[PDB]
Amino acid sequence: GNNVVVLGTQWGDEGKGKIVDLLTERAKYVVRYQGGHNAGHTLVINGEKTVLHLIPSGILRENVTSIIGNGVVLSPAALMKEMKELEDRGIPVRERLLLSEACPLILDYHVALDNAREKARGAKAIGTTGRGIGPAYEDKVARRGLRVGDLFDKETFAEKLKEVMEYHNFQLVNYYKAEAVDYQKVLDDTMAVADILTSMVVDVSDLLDQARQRGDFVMFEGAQGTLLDIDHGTYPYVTSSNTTAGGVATGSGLGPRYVDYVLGILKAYSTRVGAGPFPTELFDETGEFLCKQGNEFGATTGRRRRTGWLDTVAVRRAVQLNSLSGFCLTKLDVLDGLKEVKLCVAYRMPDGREVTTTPLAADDWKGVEPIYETMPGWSESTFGVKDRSGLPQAALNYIKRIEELTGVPIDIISTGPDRTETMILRDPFDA
Amino acid sequence: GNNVVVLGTQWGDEGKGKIVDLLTERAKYVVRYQGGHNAGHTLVINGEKTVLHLIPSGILRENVTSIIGNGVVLSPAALMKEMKELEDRGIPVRERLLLSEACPLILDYHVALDNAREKARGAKAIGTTGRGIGPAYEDKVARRGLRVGDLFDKETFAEKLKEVMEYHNFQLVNYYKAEAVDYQKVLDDTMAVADILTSMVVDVSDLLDQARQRGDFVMFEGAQGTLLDIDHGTYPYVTSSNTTAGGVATGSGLGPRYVDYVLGILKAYSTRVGAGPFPTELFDETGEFLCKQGNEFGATTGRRRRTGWLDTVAVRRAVQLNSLSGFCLTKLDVLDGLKEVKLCVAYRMPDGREVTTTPLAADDWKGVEPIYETMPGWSESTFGVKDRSGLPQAALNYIKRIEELTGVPIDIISTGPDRTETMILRDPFDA
Ligand SMILES: Nc1ncnc2c1ncn2[C@@H]1O[C@H](COP(=O)(O)O)[C@@H](O)[C@H]1O
Ligand SMILES: Nc1ncnc2c1ncn2[C@@H]1O[C@H](COP(=O)(O)O)[C@@H](O)[C@H]1O
């Protein structure tokens, strides 16, 4: 293990932040490779809780350097605010954060377009986090968007900005019948922050090629989760970047032959935020329980999380897309006390077919019914348990069964939100 | 070597088709993972020449099955026409081609938008192949585009199509002041072809996971070339998909840990079609010669290829982005007879700095001057040479030097356009 990737196996919310922090004790670098300032990675260190959206989760560690790869659509505003919070708390953010000059820039008109498209989708709305992420990526593949490097030339910057905003404001005002966005506002706002950004630029592909030669340990930190991947997820209820392990190469520039171990963060039950298929969703007292003990309330309106049983058919898809090496089970404790726990092992098709493979497009997920395997729960607390011996036999069997159905071993078990409450059965760095 | 990727190291036109055909003698599968019907992969078998744009280059082989992965933006029209040509020639295309239901569909309004945006860019035009590739990808990341799977429900299909065309025709007619696109035309055209498409659908990620278990040999066929990659290329003079090896995972669904060998196709001199930086471009009699002996005239207007000396600084960037394993030198014969051959080994920056690393954004490539290494040419013919011994010492030294500067070995040497005229020093499948 030299290059270890950390990604979510489901639809997000599996607890990726804690595991990154925890493991970066040994890493020289942590790299974000996709998404935007919509991560929501929570860190609970000896009591204090930090929530990071853009800046990588290795930022609290002293020996590590954090980088934001070219796949990340970056917002100067969000970056500034997150830098301020961390500096206020005493974290010398400026001495250990580096970024790629190829990062697309997210700006006002993007959030504006994001709201616009959602409002317009009506009942077929996606459930976007509202941060203008989708539109920013859209600009990029269309080769019309700006990038951090564009900020080297203040003069040319203005010209480009002007041509872009002209096009967008048109669709806003004329098609969405929405407010236009002030050019001078954006321009001035960006210029103000412009010099903190460029001061931090670095050639990531080259830096990562060097680390590979020096034999440094590198940790990549994915956000969102596998089934929200733009290509392989439950399209269109999906995010606009590749969340799967392939996005590591594409979004940081490290050759695909150098990924050594891929850790899939697996929540003990399922969740989803926003619209979209969800075969094992619960609507009863158990659904209620998981939400409450899981503390799945959310950020704001519409950001309260949907809950359900673990879906072994969907996790199995995640296994192949990412060539997972091991899982990290999080929140087993939320299941504590239930009479019996369940887990989907196959899907019953509308026509009676029983399959073990997930459908591709949301429309095909429409009438699938989960086929469960029921097993006894456990009465004792598993929260904070630091040793395997302290886990009830019924809890161990649930674990054993996930390993059997998926073919992948559970290498780490998180028993609490604190860095200390964890069982590392196998260090990815030592594999 | 179980999983071998074949991609272009430069700006395209390196001769990828021949090498795919050649090597698929042993492969069970060949997979396209990006781009559209704009490949232009030429196959010269015992005299007959085939040019394929969409269908993979393993289509002429009897034992192989060709697949078009989810990364490929697909056009039913182009697919139909290419299927007809091949069937006419006697190739049973329908028995060995499979596609992914996640492939975005390119349709009329896309080509229409492509022309529109180019016409509008004026002097900063990109040089698009005009096939509506960029707009199709744009629709996809914005989650508004259609996919082959959408064709399962003829009813819903119409609804979606209608909502999409409504939005696009608006920007066309109202913003680009261009012709609107006929909804019923598109609709009927697609419905006609609709049943040949769905009959060929397959779950590629699952099929590739299976091949991995059976130990089958798989060949992935990239189109375009490394420096045209949307993320790491010379943006915006670039294509809209990832051409680098990372696009294999993202565009076919094979886990990144399963890529076994990456073959970089290296043309002995450089070329580029369309706008964009090009440090070693030639404007003299040599430029003229390379174009003429190389037969770099092209497809149509604007499709005549620019020529220049081999750029070892740019190739070195390709090496890291793709974790290349070996190169395949093509067209050494075009250099035959020149007095002396050159090769860029560093770049002189505007400010006098000498670097060995390529700049990222086109604007930074602006004032770079190549720093060459000159060496003697060779008078004898190398065309058709099947054995290393038959290569002049001066030609061997040119080869040796590419290996020294890049760190990667040249495993195959193509000495002619026919499958037979090749020197395989190391089979990727046996590595
Ligand atoms: N951090 C996240 N956790 C869970 N789902 C997310 C997250 N951010 C984005 N998504 C989901 O991805 C979809 C589109 O979001 P966006 O990335 O804002 O376009 C919605 O289903 C979002 O809820
Ligand atoms: N097969 C190809 N060979 C060379 N360059 C290509 C090829 N197809 C696309 N490009 C270039 O990619 C840019 C955008 O093309 P497009 O893929 O049509 O958007 C232009 O520089 C094209 O010349």
Swiss-Prot record, chains A, B:
One of its GO terms (cellular component) is cytosol. It catalyses: IMP + L-aspartate + GTP = N(6)-(1,2-dicarboxyethyl)-AMP + GDP + phosphate + 2 H(+). Changing residue 147 to L: Reduced activity. Pathway: Purine metabolism; AMP biosynthesis via de novo pathway; AMP from IMP: step 1/2. GO terms for biological process: 'de novo' AMP biosynthetic process; adenosine biosynthetic process; DNA damage response; IMP metabolic process; nucleobase-containing small molecule interconversion; purine nucleotide biosynthetic process. InterPro entries: Adenylosuccin_syn_GTP-bd, Adenylosuccin_syn_Lys_AS, Adenylosuccinate_synth_dom1, Adenylosuccinate_synth_dom2, Adenylosuccinate_synth_dom3, Adenylosuccinate_synthetase, P-loop_NTPase. The keyword Transmembrane helix does not apply. Transmembrane segments: none annotated. GO terms for molecular function: adenylosuccinate synthase activity; GTP binding; guanosine tetraphosphate binding; magnesium ion binding. SMART domains: Adenylsucc_synt (SM00788). Mg(2+) binds at residues 13, 40. Coiled coil: none annotated. Binds 1 Mg(2+) ion per subunit. The active site is at 13 (proton acceptor), 41 (proton donor). IMP binds at residues 13-16, 38-41, 129, 143, 224, 239, 303. Disulfide bonds: none annotated. Its main location: cytoplasm. Its cofactor is Mg(2+). NCBIfam families: PRK01117.1 (NF002223), purA (TIGR00184). Plays an important role in the de novo pathway of purine nucleotide biosynthesis. Catalyzes the first committed step in the biosynthesis of AMP from IMP. This is Adenylosuccinate synthetase. It comes from Escherichia coli (strain K12).
